[PDB]
Structure 1
Amino acid sequence: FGFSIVLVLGSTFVAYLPDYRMQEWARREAERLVKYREAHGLPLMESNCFDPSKIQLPED
Protein backbone atom coordinates (compact mmCIF):
# COMPACT_ATOMS: atom_id res chain seq x y z
CA PHE A 1 0.00 0.00 0.00
CA GLY A 2 2.99 2.33 -0.27
CA PHE A 3 4.80 1.26 -3.44
CA SER A 4 2.90 -1.47 -5.28
CA ILE A 5 -0.37 0.48 -5.52
CA VAL A 6 0.92 4.04 -5.11
CA LEU A 7 4.18 4.48 -6.99
CA VAL A 8 3.65 2.64 -10.29
CA LEU A 9 -0.01 3.72 -10.44
CA GLY A 10 1.08 7.31 -9.85
CA SER A 11 3.69 6.89 -12.59
CA THR A 12 1.02 5.74 -15.04
CA PHE A 13 -1.26 8.53 -13.83
CA VAL A 14 1.23 11.38 -14.28
CA ALA A 15 2.69 9.88 -17.47
CA TYR A 16 -0.42 10.88 -19.41
CA LEU A 17 -3.41 12.97 -18.41
CA PRO A 18 -5.15 15.83 -20.33
CA ASP A 19 -3.18 18.53 -22.12
CA TYR A 20 -1.46 20.28 -19.24
CA ARG A 21 -1.46 24.08 -19.73
CA MET A 22 -3.21 23.26 -23.07
CA GLN A 23 0.15 22.33 -24.53
CA GLU A 24 -0.48 20.08 -27.52
CA TRP A 25 -3.74 21.95 -28.04
CA ALA A 26 -1.54 25.03 -28.53
CA ARG A 27 0.70 22.99 -30.86
CA ARG A 28 -2.12 21.98 -33.19
CA GLU A 29 -3.76 25.41 -32.88
CA ALA A 30 -0.50 27.08 -33.91
CA GLU A 31 -0.10 24.70 -36.85
CA ARG A 32 -3.60 25.51 -38.12
CA LEU A 33 -3.10 29.25 -37.50
CA VAL A 34 0.25 29.40 -39.33
CA LYS A 35 -1.23 27.51 -42.31
CA TYR A 36 -4.25 29.85 -42.17
CA ARG A 37 -2.17 33.03 -42.22
CA GLU A 38 0.16 31.66 -44.91
CA ALA A 39 -2.89 30.89 -47.05
CA HIS A 40 -4.43 34.35 -46.53
CA GLY A 41 -1.24 36.13 -47.63
CA LEU A 42 -0.82 38.27 -44.50
CA PRO A 43 2.38 37.79 -42.45
CA LEU A 44 2.22 35.44 -39.47
CA MET A 45 1.99 37.16 -36.07
CA GLU A 46 0.38 40.43 -36.95
CA SER A 47 1.99 42.82 -34.48
CA ASN A 48 -0.05 45.22 -32.31
CA CYS A 49 -2.23 42.45 -30.85
CA PHE A 50 -4.78 45.02 -29.74
CA ASP A 51 -6.53 46.90 -32.53
CA PRO A 52 -4.75 50.22 -33.28
CA SER A 53 -8.06 51.68 -34.45
CA LYS A 54 -9.44 50.70 -31.02
CA ILE A 55 -7.50 53.29 -29.06
CA GLN A 56 -8.41 56.66 -27.54
CA LEU A 57 -5.04 58.28 -26.92
CA PRO A 58 -4.70 61.08 -24.35
CA GLU A 59 -3.90 64.05 -26.58
CA ASP A 60 -1.32 66.68 -25.72
Structure 2
Amino acid sequence: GSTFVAYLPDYRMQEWARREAERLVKYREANGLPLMESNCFDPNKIQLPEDED
Protein backbone atom coordinates (compact mmCIF):
# COMPACT_ATOMS: atom_id res chain seq x y z
CA GLY A 1 0.00 0.00 0.00
CA SER A 2 2.86 2.39 0.73
CA THR A 3 4.42 1.62 -2.66
CA PHE A 4 1.01 2.12 -4.30
CA VAL A 5 0.59 5.52 -2.62
CA ALA A 6 4.15 6.48 -3.59
CA TYR A 7 3.50 5.83 -7.30
CA LEU A 8 0.03 7.36 -7.56
CA PRO A 9 -0.43 9.20 -10.88
CA ASP A 10 -0.46 12.99 -10.87
CA TYR A 11 -4.20 13.65 -10.75
CA ARG A 12 -3.49 16.83 -8.75
CA MET A 13 -1.70 18.24 -11.83
CA GLN A 14 1.45 19.58 -10.19
CA GLU A 15 3.77 19.05 -13.16
CA TRP A 16 0.96 20.13 -15.49
CA ALA A 17 0.64 23.46 -13.68
CA ARG A 18 4.42 23.84 -13.63
CA ARG A 19 4.65 23.33 -17.40
CA GLU A 20 1.74 25.70 -18.05
CA ALA A 21 3.38 28.37 -15.90
CA GLU A 22 6.73 27.77 -17.62
CA ARG A 23 5.35 28.32 -21.12
CA LEU A 24 3.20 31.24 -19.97
CA VAL A 25 6.18 32.99 -18.35
CA LYS A 26 8.30 32.29 -21.43
CA TYR A 27 5.61 33.88 -23.61
CA ARG A 28 5.09 36.99 -21.46
CA GLU A 29 8.82 37.56 -20.91
CA ALA A 30 9.41 37.32 -24.66
CA ASN A 31 6.63 39.79 -25.46
CA GLY A 32 7.44 42.17 -22.60
CA LEU A 33 4.04 41.70 -20.97
CA PRO A 34 4.01 42.55 -17.24
CA LEU A 35 4.04 38.89 -16.09
CA MET A 36 0.93 38.42 -13.90
CA GLU A 37 -1.96 40.83 -14.38
CA SER A 38 -3.62 42.45 -11.39
CA ASN A 39 -7.13 41.79 -12.76
CA CYS A 40 -8.37 38.20 -12.67
CA PHE A 41 -11.12 38.91 -15.23
CA ASP A 42 -11.17 41.32 -18.15
CA PRO A 43 -12.75 44.66 -17.14
CA ASN A 44 -14.46 45.15 -20.51
CA LYS A 45 -16.86 42.28 -19.81
CA ILE A 46 -17.89 43.53 -16.34
CA GLN A 47 -20.77 46.03 -16.14
CA LEU A 48 -20.39 48.17 -13.03
CA PRO A 49 -23.43 50.04 -11.70
CA GLU A 50 -23.26 53.75 -12.47
CA ASP A 51 -23.47 55.75 -9.25
CA GLU A 52 -24.31 59.31 -10.39
CA ASP A 53 -23.80 60.50 -6.82
TM bucket by the smaller chain? 0.7 to 0.9
With structure 1 as the length reference, what TM-score do the two structures score? 0.70
With structure 2 as the length reference, what TM-score do the two structures score? 0.77
Number of aligned positions between the proteins: 51
Tell me how far apart the structure 2 counterparts of residues 30 and 39 of structure 1 sit (CA, whole Å).
Answer: 14
Instruction: Output the aligned Cα RMSD.
Output: 1.6
Q: RCO greater where, 1 or 2, for CA within 8 Å and sep 6 or more?
A: 2
SS of residue paired to 1:57: coil
Larger radius of gyration: 1
Unaligned runs of 5+ in 2: none
Aligned structure 1 segments of 4 or more residues deviating by more than 4 angstroms? none
Tell me how far apart the structure 2 counterparts of residues 33 and 22 of structure 1 sit (CA, whole Å).
Answer: 16
